[PDB]
Design a protein around this ligand. Structure first.
Ligand SMILES: CCCCCCCCCCCCCCCCCCCC(=O)O[C@H](COC(=O)CCCCCCCCCCCCCC)COP(=O)(O)OCCN
Ligand SMILES: NC(=O)C1=CN([C@@H]2O[C@H](COP(=O)(O)OP(=O)(O)OC[C@H]3O[C@@H](n4cnc5c(N)ncnc54)[C@H](OP(=O)(O)O)[C@@H]3O)[C@@H](O)[C@H]2O)C=CC1
Ligand code: SF4
Ligand code: SF4
Lengths: 135, 150, 363, 199, 216, 62, 383, 90, 119
């Protein structure tokens, strides 16, 4: 990106970059770390147990959390987790906290409680260039 | 040269002498209309050359050393009621910088039905009016059927 | 002719884009009553031709009143020239005269406006053959045996109009109230803006004022009814009042707590108004001169101006006239009271009004 | 410069924040505290004695002594192109016959419905209009009618100076549009000799 | 609050391969399998984000619009944070003639989605003011234009039409020019509404070919 | 009063797409209203009307 | 004490505002709109697709061709129409000229509302130059109707790129002399710094887009994330600030003018030779010489200018990075030659909804600054 | 510092109605002058919508979805931004 | 006991409470009284006395509410009340048993070829 300030800013220092884009003032003044991401993801893994075992929602949340924790485990520096998960760690901790917050509302609504012969029609679109252009 | 200035002033105003110029009603309106005053006294007497004259009497000047879009100007012959609707269409595209053609360098094709340019008639009672108007010679009732008259 | 005027060419339900079939010429169309008449005709889909003498700025408000092509404007009218009158009426089957005068000038006298022009207008109207209706306006107090010159010249011109055009209708309304009138406006300019307001004698002469919209409706009702051709109608409101009652009503409405009027004998009022009446000629006419500062007004104040017994009035036209003392007619004079019109405290009734309304009005 | 100061802050929450906490010293867009005497004198000569107003004043004084961009209408005109969409006009062949053949394509394409057409056959068998109206107060001056015409009969000419005093003067019928074409024919042909290479 | 400026270099890429593949191919099946009771119908079509892809459309009941939108906002794989608009489409041939349409954008993974609810004229739709703050004015406009009532709204009032305007103009049975028109009256000294009269009535051109195959 | 009807094929052409033959594919049934008064504009001759339902059934309701 | 709010009516003369104050501090702002609502969404159902195109010029009438772009792209996606290369380059070039025009007007009208009168008069002569560029290719200074389905309406006249290069050679100097009056001035800073702050969470929750979104530290440009026409080939930067200030939005808008100049320079050097319109004759009308010489071209000219093309049944939403944010069209097709439903999404509608939460804690003389920095035009707000 | 207001012939030297070189604008591709068949390029009418089999008893394996995702900074693969929209050769 | 929760009479009571502030703000003190205004608003309510659906009742009450705040906030002036509320009522109760023996058909016949549209 281009910085509109006429002064020279380093931006290799990651704390300066987090200050300049307003992460400190507007999202989280406390710096997010790898341990806080691990704690938040384990909070999600504890919170999802209110969903039934056979539900696809629980499997989806658990698989996402397990992949995130494996990324956290195999990478020690927080810049590596930033480069893998394509965000700032403050964003990722907020994502995990929001995912943990979501669980009681979904569990109260119970979307998994459909009949056994539940049916959803789907209509898909095929482009003309599939049959007109070269295979 | 001030002699050049006065010769330019006399050829632009169309008068015969400085005494005839300063004692005219055209100079009287140039004391109260500053747009005409600037056009006659400053622009037409400056650097530039005369290009041509239309049939309404307006003179056309140009200056290639000026800024773009201020290279061409007109001196209207009607000093008291000057109007851009008296510019003929063969000078209109030259003066509006649409093309570089005028009668002095281009022979236009003249249709046999061509109506010459004259001043607008709006605000008077000889303006254009539709055929259903009160000002027409015979107003139209636009009925699409014929009534039975016994 | 009879009721073929209002039925034969009527196209559309009667709005701005419809056609009524009436082509009308209104003389004095930029005036007080003429503007309301021109609005009444044009809104129903009639073509209205308006000649005028004044500048175009004072006639521009008539341009709005009708659809495209239906308001015709003819400036530089000279009523001493028959060519202008002939051109203005050359397509009209209705002519309405609202030309009148209140003060004399070195260029125009009462006979020139109330006598000579109505006679020549009636003659030129009868010459065309296509004019089916001529509506001439005069006053309720018009009389040939009147000491006031304008009433006498008006009655003489009424006689000349009924002579030259035998089916012309003569309309004689009382005092007309309105936003731009010449009746309450000059009375309010007399109650305020002066050290004292003279009242002629005891102020016990009776009048019958009427509303301007009722007169405008009366013209259309006359054009509907064929029997009203050649007749004379008196237009007056539902209440008969004296001038003292009118002054008391204006002083109560204006909320003025000091009666500045003084009752004076008629010779004293005429002695006051005499120096500015012997100099009324050799002068082109001055602004802000009251039409009440003349001896003719003093002579009018010594007589009753009411509807005569057995005369044709509003009821024969099917019109119930609106009250003049209260309602919409008195609302313009309520705007000139001390301090302003205003609502009030507005808190007794805002008790059970909803939430955002009180905060919106800051109550 | 785009630098910030504690005190030049336009609001109150940030003014209260800068005078009770040193969080503004972490932000890189702020100007730092002067460290020695000369820096204090530079900061005071910035705040007192202005010198930021003076740069704008020097620029506007330079503009006072510079050249001007005003044209003296109506003795001088602006600049337009042969594609310019002005007053509508109806055209003829060089013989003097109308080009229009009442196909009603320009009436169909008109998004404003500003065109009204009636036609019948002429006494020599030709297909010609009897009514061709353009409501210029309904027109949007798009030029779609010029594009739809297959015989180049309706054009938008190079005229833009046609303001009137009554609105009835702007409801053009067929005769006035032919009169406009007869007025502007040579200019329209000169414009179309260039624009036919592109269209 | 996402898509913070992180890379200081110029980026020549959009998304990652695995997440773009998931969003462009598997998102319909994912949403159907995780929350099946919320979804009643799905269409995967020509992709709001770009001409080169496909993107899903989800049909839901009004009873579960709010939980589905909360799930689509807060779930870690579907982070649809921005609600771009709320509108309606009128289908007078149907028993429930209105389709309320919600468009969403995910700044986290460069995605878009569309959510539909079918109701008639007298069935309320739950408001999304608590989920998305822009839902206020869009629901006000939808009520103004179509007459769809949004229950639980803080202040459902008209926003676009005239002050005394009754009637919902974007319905198919509402006339293009309306019922009333406006002019100044010299007698009443007020701007007055009157029944409609036109100097030139609107000309309807019926162009449609009797050989055309595409009309549905 | 309204009329519910499906318009017949035009005599000038042979195609059947705007008929009740393709009724399940394409909406073909219409709602139409009786005409109200029309007249000519005195200034130009354009056709004037006061009907608000002049084109709403023939353009929009299928 | 129990202080009631003092309310104020702010202007019939087309924004109407009903404020509430607790002294000199605003507690509430309620915009009343619809004074320019002309019902263009209803009128588009009664037009063919070519007939309804000039409605879009009159939505954001400071930025016309960008409004045309999204409607054209929405039609082209359902039609499955490809645009040739030269037409894509022309569309990108004139979209960036449009963005420069809009940002000139927005910054100088804002600075005139604050009180600085000279930058307005300096920038409008540059606006006149870009209007001459519009007129030389379309014949209209503002409502060009230039972008069409499948390409552009006419080719570029010979001599246009020469003059666009001559303008772009001095535009940076004009932007430089513009910033000498405003950027390092204490009165402008004291009016604009920390006024109406927008954080990222509030920006996404309130549907923000455009230069508002970039001044709150969000890297989101539709020309780089979801590119359209030849914007993926263009090399430019996204300016980023991090306070959410009026001052930061002003700086972001100036830098966006610089980047638009960069894209304009790149388009002037890579303009290819070839077709500017799609060669599908059943969508794009033929040339005027072809129409006067072949029967199929005349038939297609007759039918495309009366009935128009039939768009296949379906729906789409297509968006463009308009100079005020994201401008989008939701087109619903039943299969006819007329749109069944055409919803128009405007960014200024969403930006004006925020005035209740942005003006809280501000004073009366900062309302006009907030309205000016949101960059609102009521044609697109009131459709 | 570049000056506003260029002088004579330094800007718009020729008016657009007096272009010094005649323009030859292509309006058709050379590939389509003599090869005019349309059904091989009818992209408008060849798109399809197909009703999928009813998405009920499908097998969404999340293990495969998360098994194709990277775990290290290198081995992250990014989709490059498309340079142009499809032109189909024109 | 009262159909659909008695919401019609509750809304009527709310409007009747709101009415004297309308009369003061719109300056209708000498034009209509509160008794005849209450009777007129009551006559607006009886036109939908045969609605069999509660959701239609709720929508009608919501729309009538929005009408009453657009009258409260001076977004429609006194001439709007005249031309929309009280003169239609006085026309519906003034033409009853007219002074002429003409049927409604014959008045319609003499007026125009078609029925009147609107008011
Ligand atoms: C011809 C017309 C001439 C005027 C043209 C320019 C108009 C400018 C108007 C705005 C001026 C702003 C202004 O005065 O700002 C103040 C500083 O300047 C001043 O106070 C300036 C006035 C005083 C001049 C300097 C006085 C001290 C000089 C040295 C004295 C000691 C040595 C000699 C004995 C305070 O702004 P701030 O930011 O400082 O406010 C501190 C808290 N925020
Ligand atoms: N209460 C009332 O006002 C009453 C009025 N009438 C009569 O009804 C008519 C209403 O006139 P009103 O409008 O009330 O008052 P106005 O004075 O406003 O009517 C004057 C009109 O007559 C025109 N006029 C006067 N003298 C001449 C002239 N010499 N040549 C041409 N035009 C002339 C005026 O034109 P300009 O504006 O150029 O002078 C103006 O249009 C008058 O005849 C009046 O006597 C009857 C009873 C009472
Ligand atoms: S230019 Fe446009 S508005 Fe004017 S007549 Fe042609 S199509 Fe109609
Ligand atoms: S002007 Fe051209 S398009 Fe219009 S009717 Fe005549 S020939 Fe047809």
């Amino acid at each position: 990106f281009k910085a509109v300030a006429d002064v020279e800013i380093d931006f290799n220092n990651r704390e300066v970059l987090k200050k300049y884009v307003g992460i400190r003032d507007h999202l989280s003044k406390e710096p997010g770390t790898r341990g806080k991401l691990i704690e938040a993801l384990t909070e999600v893994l504890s919170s999802i147990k209110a969903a039934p075992e056979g539900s696809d929602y629980r499997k989806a949340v658990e698989a996402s959390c397990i992949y995130r924790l494996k990324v956290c485990k195999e990478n020690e520096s927080d810049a590596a987790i930033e480069e893998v998960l394509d965000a700032h760690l403050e964003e990722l901790i907020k994502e995990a906290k929001e995912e943990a917050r979501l669980v009681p509302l979904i569990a109260g609504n119970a979307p998994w409680d459909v009949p056994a012969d539940y049916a959803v029609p789907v209509v898909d679109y095929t482009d003309a260039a599939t049959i007109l252009d070269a295979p | 040269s001030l002699s050049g200035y006065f010769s330019r002033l006399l050829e632009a105003s169309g008068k015969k002498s400085v005494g005839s110029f300063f004692a005219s009603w055209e100079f009287g309106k140039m004391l109260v209309d500053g747009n005409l005053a600037h056009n006659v006294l400053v622009r037409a007497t400056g650097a530039g050359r005369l290009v041509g004259t239309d049939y309404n009497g307006n003179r056309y000047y140009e200056n290639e050393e000026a800024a773009y879009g201020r290279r061409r100007w007109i001196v209207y012959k009607d000093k008291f009621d000057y109007n851009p609707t008296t510019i003929p269409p063969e000078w209109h595209g030259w003066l509006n910088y649409i093309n570089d053609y005028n009668p002095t360098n281009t022979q236009f094709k003249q249709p046999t039905y061509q109506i010459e340019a004259s001043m607008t008639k709006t605000g008077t009672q000889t303006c254009y009016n539709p055929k259903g108007s009160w000002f027409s010679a015979k107003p139209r009732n636009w009925r699409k059927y014929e009534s039975w008259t016994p | 002719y009879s009721s073929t005027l209002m039925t034969a060419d009527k196209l559309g339900p009667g709005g701005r884009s419809s056609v009524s079939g009436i082509t009308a010429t209104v003389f004095g169309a930029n005036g007080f009553l003429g503007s309301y008449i021109v609005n009444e005709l044009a809104k129903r889909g009639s073509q209205v031709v308006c000649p005028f003498r004044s500048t175009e700025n004072e006639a521009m408000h008539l341009k709005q009143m009708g659809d495209l092509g239906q308001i015709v404007l003819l400036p530089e009218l000279d009523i001493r020239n028959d060519d202008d009158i002939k051109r203005a009426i050359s397509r009209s089957n209705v002519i309405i005269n609202c030309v009148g005068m209140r003060l004399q000038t070195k260029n125009w006298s009462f006979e020139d406006v109330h006598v000579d022009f109505p006679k020549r207008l009636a003659k030129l109207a009868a010459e065309t053959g296509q004019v089916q209706r001529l509506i001439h306006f005069s006053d309720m107090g018009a009389d040939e045996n009147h000491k006031s010159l304008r009433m006498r010249t008006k009655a003489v011109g009424d006689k000349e109009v009924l002579d030259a055009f035998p089916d012309a209708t003569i309309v004689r309304p009382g005092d007309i109230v309105g936003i731009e009138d010449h009746f309450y406006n000059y009375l309010i300019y007399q109650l305020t803006l002066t050290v004292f307001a003279p009242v002629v004698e005891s102020g016990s002469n009776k009048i019958q004022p009427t509303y301007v919209l009722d007169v405008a409706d009366a013209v259309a009702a006359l054009l509907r009814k064929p029997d009203t051709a050649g007749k004379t109608l008196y237009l007056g409101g539902p209440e008969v009042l004296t001038m003292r009652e009118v002054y008391d009503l204006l002083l109560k409405t204006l909320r003025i707590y000091r009666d500045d009027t003084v009752h004076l004998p008629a010779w004293a009022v005429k002695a006051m108004y005499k120096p500015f009446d012997s100099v009324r000629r050799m002068l082109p006419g001055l602004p802000m001169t009251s039409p009440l500062a003349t001896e003719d007004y003093v002579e009018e104040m010594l007589r009753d101006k009411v509807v005569p017994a057995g005369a044709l009035g509003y009821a024969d036209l099917g019109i119930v006239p609106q009250k003049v003392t209260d309602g919409l007619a008195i609302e313009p004079v309520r705007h000139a009271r001390v301090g302003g019109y205003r609502w009030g405290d507005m808190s007794a009734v805002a008790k059970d009004i909803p939430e955002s309304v009180r905060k919106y009005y800051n109550i | 410069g785009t630098e910030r100061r504690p005190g030049e802050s336009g609001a109150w929450k940030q003014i209260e924040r800068q005078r009770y906490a040193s969080d503004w010293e972490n932000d890189p867009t702020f100007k730092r505290t002067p460290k020695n005497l000369a820096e204090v004198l530079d900061d005071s000569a910035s705040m007192l004695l202005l010198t930021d107003v003076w740069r704008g004043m020097a620029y506007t004084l330079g503009a006072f002594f510079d050249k001007k961009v005003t044209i003296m209408y109506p003795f001088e005109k602006g600049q337009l192109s042969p594609r310019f969409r002005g007053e509508h006009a109806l055209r003829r062949y060089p013989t003097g016959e109308e080009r229009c053949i009442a196909c009603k394509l320009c009436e169909a394409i008109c998004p404003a419905q500003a065109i009204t057409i009636e036609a019948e056959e002429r006494e020599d068998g030709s297909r010609r209009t009897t009514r061709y109206d353009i409501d210029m107060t309904k027109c949007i001056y798009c030029g779609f009618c010029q594009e739809a015409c297959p015989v180049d009969a309706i054009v938008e000419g190079p005229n833009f100076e046609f303001s009137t005093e009554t609105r009835e003067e702007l409801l053009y019928d067929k005769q006035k549009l032919l009169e406009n074409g007869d007025k502007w024919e040579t200019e329209i042909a000169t414009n179309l000799r260039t624009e036919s290479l592109y269209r | 609050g996402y898509a913070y400026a992180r890379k200081t270099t110029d980026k020549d890429y959009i998304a990652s391969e695995h997440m773009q593949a998931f969003g462009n191919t598997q998102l319909t099946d994912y949403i159907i399998k995780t929350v099946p009771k919320f979804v009643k119908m799905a269409v995967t079509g020509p992709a709001q984000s770009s001409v080169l892809y496909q993107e899903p459309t989800i049909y839901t009941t009004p009873e579960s619009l709010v939980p589905l939108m909360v799930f689509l906002r807060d779930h870690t794989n579907t982070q649809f944070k921005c609600l771009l608009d709320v509108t309606a489409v009128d289908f007078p041939e149907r028993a429930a003639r209105f389709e309320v349409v919600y468009h969403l954008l995910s700044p986290r993974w460069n995605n878009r989605i569309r959510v539909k609810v079918c109701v008639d004229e007298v069935t309320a739709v739950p408001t999304l003011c608590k989920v998305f703050n822009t839902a206020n004015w869009f629901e006000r406009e939808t009520w103004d234009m179509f007459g769809v009532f949004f229950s639980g709204h803080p202040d459902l009032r008209r926003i676009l039409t005239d002050y005394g305007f009754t009637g919902h103009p974007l319905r198919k049975d509402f006339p293009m020019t309306g019922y009333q028109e406006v002019r100044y009256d010299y007698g009443k000294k007020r701007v007055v509404s009157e029944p409609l009269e036109l100097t030139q009535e609107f000309r309807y051109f019926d162009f449609n070919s009797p050989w055309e195959t595409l009309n549905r | 009063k309204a009329r519910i009807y499906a318009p017949a094929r035009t005599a000038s052409q042979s195609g059947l797409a705007r008929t009740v033959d393709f009724a399940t594919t394409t909406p073909a049934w219409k709602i139409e209203f009786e005409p109200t008064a029309k007249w000519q504009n005195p200034l130009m001759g354009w056709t004037s009307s006061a009907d608000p339902l002049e084109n709403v059934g023939r353009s929009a309701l299928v | 004490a129990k202080v009631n709010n003092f309310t104020l009516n702010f202007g019939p003369q087309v924004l109407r505002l009903v404020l509430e104050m607790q002294g000199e501090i605003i507690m509430r702002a309620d915009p009343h709109i619809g004074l320019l609502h002309r019902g263009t969404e209803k009128l588009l159902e009664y037009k063919t697709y070519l007939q309804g195109l000039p409605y879009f010029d009159r939505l954001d009438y400071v930025s016309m061709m960008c409004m045309e772009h999204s409607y054209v792209l929405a039609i082209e996606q359902l039609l499955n129409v490809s645009v040739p290369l030269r037409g894509q380059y022309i569309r990108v070039l004139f979209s960036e000229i449009t963005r420069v025009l809009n940002h000139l007007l927005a910054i100088t009208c804002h600075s005139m509302d604050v009180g600085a009168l000279t930058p307005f008069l300096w920038a409008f002569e540059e606006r006149e130059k870009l209007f001459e560029f519009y007129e030389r290719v379309s014949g209209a200074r503002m409502h060009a109707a230039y972008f069409r389905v499948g390409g552009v309406s006419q080719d570029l006249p010979i001599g246009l790129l020469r003059d666009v290069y001559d303008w772009a050679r001095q535009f940076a100097s004009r932007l430089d002399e513009m910033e000498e009056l405003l950027t390092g001035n204490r009165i402008w800073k004291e009016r604009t710094v920390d006024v109406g702050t927008i954080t990222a969470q509030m920006a996404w929750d309130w549907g923000c887009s455009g230069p508002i979104l970039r001044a709150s530290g969000i890297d989101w440009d539709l020309r780089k994330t979801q590119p359209y026409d030849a914007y993926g080939k263009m090399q430019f930067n996204v300016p980023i600030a991090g306070h959410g200030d009026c001052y930061d939005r002003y700086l972001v808008r100036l830098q966006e003018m610089r980047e638009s100049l960069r894209i304009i320079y790149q388009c002037l050097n890579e303009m290819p030779d070839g077709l500017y319109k799609s060669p599908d004759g059943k969508v794009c009308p033929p040339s005027r010489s072809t129409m006067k010489q072949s029967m199929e071209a005349l038939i297609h000219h007759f039918k495309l200018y009366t009935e128009g093309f039939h768009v296949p049944a379906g729906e789409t939403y297509r968006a463009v990075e308009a100079p005020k944010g994201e401008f989008g069209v939701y087109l619903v097709s039943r299969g006819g030659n007329r749109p069944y439903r055409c919803k128009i999404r405007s960014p200024g509608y969403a930006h004006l909804q925020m005035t209740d939460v942005i003006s809280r804690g501000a004073m009366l003389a900062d309302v006009v600054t907030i309205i000016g920095t949101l960059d609102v035009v009521f044609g697109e707000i009131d459709r | 510092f570049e000056h506003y207001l260029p002088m004579g012939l330094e800007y718009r030297k020729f008016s657009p109605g007096t272009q010094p070189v005649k323009a030859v604008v292509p309006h058709d591709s050379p590939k389509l002058v003599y090869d005019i068949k349309y059904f091989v390029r009818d992209y408008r009418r060849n798109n399809k919508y197909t009703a999928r089999t009813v998405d009920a008893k499908t097998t969404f394996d999340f293990d495969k979805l998360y098994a194709g995702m990277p775990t290290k900074p290198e081995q992250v693969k990014n989709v490059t931004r498309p340079l142009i929209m499809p032109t189909r050769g024109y | 006991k009262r159909l659909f929760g008695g919401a019609a009479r509750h809304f009527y009571f709310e409007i009747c409470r709101c009415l004297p502030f309308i009369q003061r703000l719109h300056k209708m003190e000498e034009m209509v009284s509160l008794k005849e205004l209450r009777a007129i608003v009551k006559e607006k309510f009886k036109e939908y006395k045969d609605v069999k659906d509660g959701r239609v009742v709720d929508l009608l009450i919501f729309k009538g509410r929005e009408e009453i705040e657009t009258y409260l906030l001076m977004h429609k002036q006194r001439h709007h009340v005249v031309t929309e509320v009280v003169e239609p009522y006085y026309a519906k109760q003034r033409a009853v048993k007219k002074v002429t023996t003409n049927s409604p058909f014959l008045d319609s016949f003499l007026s125009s070829g078609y029925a009147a549209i609107g008011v």
